[PDB]
């Protein structure tokens, strides 16, 4: 299920620590990534998009994204309405109802 080892090129062995390899492979290049500004104080720069190490810590902790978006609860079609600054969306199921 793991597969083969990238070092040997042959199918992986029994007893091979494959979690430490994962941690290292993901962390080592962590300096090639954007980050949160290093300044003592200021305004939250998250107003703009920041999608490097922040996004990764987010996902690996499974906390709620900032620029969240809702996902379809049920397949079907969509009915879209717009008030002033508010979007309303209604999904109508193709087979079921409600």
Partner 1 sequence: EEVGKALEEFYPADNPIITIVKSGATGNLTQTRTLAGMKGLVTNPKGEFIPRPIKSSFREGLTVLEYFINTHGARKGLADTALRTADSGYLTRRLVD
Partner 2 sequence: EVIAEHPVLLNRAPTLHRLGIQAFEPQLVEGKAIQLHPLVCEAFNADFDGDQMAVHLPLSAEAQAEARILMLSSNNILSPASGKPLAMPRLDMVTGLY
Partner 3 sequence: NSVPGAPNRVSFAKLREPLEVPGLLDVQTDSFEWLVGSDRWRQAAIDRGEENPVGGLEEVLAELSPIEDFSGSMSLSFSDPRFDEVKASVDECKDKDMTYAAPLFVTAEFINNNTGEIKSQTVFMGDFPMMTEKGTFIINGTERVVVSQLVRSPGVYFDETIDKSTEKTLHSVKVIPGRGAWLEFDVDKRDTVGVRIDRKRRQPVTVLLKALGWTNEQIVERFGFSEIMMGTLEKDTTSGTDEALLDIYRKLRPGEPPTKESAQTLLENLFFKEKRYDLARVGRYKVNKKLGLNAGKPITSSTLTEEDVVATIEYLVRLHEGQTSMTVPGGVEVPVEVDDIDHFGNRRLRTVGELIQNQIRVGLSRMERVVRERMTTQDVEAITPQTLINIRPVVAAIKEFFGTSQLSQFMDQNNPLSGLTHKRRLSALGPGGLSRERAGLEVRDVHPSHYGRMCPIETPEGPNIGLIGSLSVYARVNPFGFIETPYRKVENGVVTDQIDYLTADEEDRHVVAQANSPTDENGRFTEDRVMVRKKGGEVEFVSADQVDYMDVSPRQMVSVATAMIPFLEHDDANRALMGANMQRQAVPLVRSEAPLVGTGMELRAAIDAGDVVVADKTGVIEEVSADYITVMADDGTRQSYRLRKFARSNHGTCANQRPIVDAGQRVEAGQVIADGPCTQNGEMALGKNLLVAIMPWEGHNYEDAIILSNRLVEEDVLTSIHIEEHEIDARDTKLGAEEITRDIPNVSDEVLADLDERGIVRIGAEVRDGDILVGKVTPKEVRDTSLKVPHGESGKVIGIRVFSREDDDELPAGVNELVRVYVAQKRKISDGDKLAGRHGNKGVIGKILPVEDMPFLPDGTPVDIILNTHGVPRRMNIGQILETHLGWVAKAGWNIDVAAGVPDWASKLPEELYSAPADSTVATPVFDGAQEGELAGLLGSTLPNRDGEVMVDADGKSTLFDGRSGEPFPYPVTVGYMYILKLHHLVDDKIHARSTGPYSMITQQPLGGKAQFGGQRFGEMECWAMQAYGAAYTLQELLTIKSDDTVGRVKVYEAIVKGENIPEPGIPESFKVLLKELQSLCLNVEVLS
What residues line the site for partner 1 (CB under 8 A)? 19-20, 22-24, 26-28, 30-31, 35, 37-39, 53, 56-57, 60
**From candidates 31, 44, 67, 83, binder to partner 3 by CB under 8 A:** 44
Distance CA 34, CA 43 (A): 18
**For partner 2, the closer CB: 24 or 34:** 24
Q: Is 3 annotated as a binding residue?
A: no
Q: How far is CA 44 from CA 40, 41, 61, in A?
A: 12, 9, 21
- Which residues contact partner 2 by CB under 8 A? 5-9, 21, 24-25, 27-28
């Amino acid at each position: 299920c793991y597969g083969r080892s990238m070092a040997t090129g042959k199918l992986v062995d029994i007893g091979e620590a494959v979690g430490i390899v994962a941690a290292q492979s993901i962390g080592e290049p962590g300096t090639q990534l954007t980050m949160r500004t290093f300044h003592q104080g200021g305004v939250t720069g998250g107003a703009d998009i920041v999608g490097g190490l922040p996004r990764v810590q987010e996902l690996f902790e499974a906390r709620v994204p900032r620029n969240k978006a809702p996902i379809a609860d049920v397949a079907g079609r969509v009915r879209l309405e717009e008030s002033d600054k508010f979007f309303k969306i209604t999904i109508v199921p193709d087979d079921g109802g409600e």
